[PDB]
Amino acid sequence: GQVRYRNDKNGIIHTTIGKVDFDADKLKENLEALLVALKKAKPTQAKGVYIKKVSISTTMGAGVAVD
């Protein structure tokens, strides 16, 4: 559907993607969609590396990032 969020003052944001029933392909497409979304807003004031760690977790799962 639609999702919108505002990053934390500490430079980190958490986002709801959907129900974990979705498969890995859905997770990956949503991840890349939001990645491009935030890379559009990537401003000049943001120097150097931008995507540090997108720690995806769940109600009973650990938080891990991707490339």
Partner RNA sequence: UGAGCCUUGAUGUGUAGGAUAGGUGGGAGGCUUUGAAGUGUGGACGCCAGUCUGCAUGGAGCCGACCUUGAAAUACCACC
By C-alpha distance, which of 19, 13, 15 is closest to 3?
Answer: 15
Question: Binding of RNA at residue 4 (CB under 7 A)?
Answer: no
Q: Judged by CB under 7 A, which of 26, 42, 50, 63 binds RNA?
A: 63
User: Which of 16/45 has CB closer to RNA?
Assistant: 16
User: Which of 42/64 has CB closer to RNA?
Assistant: 64
User: Which of 6/47 has CB closer to RNA?
Assistant: 6
Long-range contacts for 48-55 (Cβ within 8 Å, ≥24 apart)? 52/11, 55/14
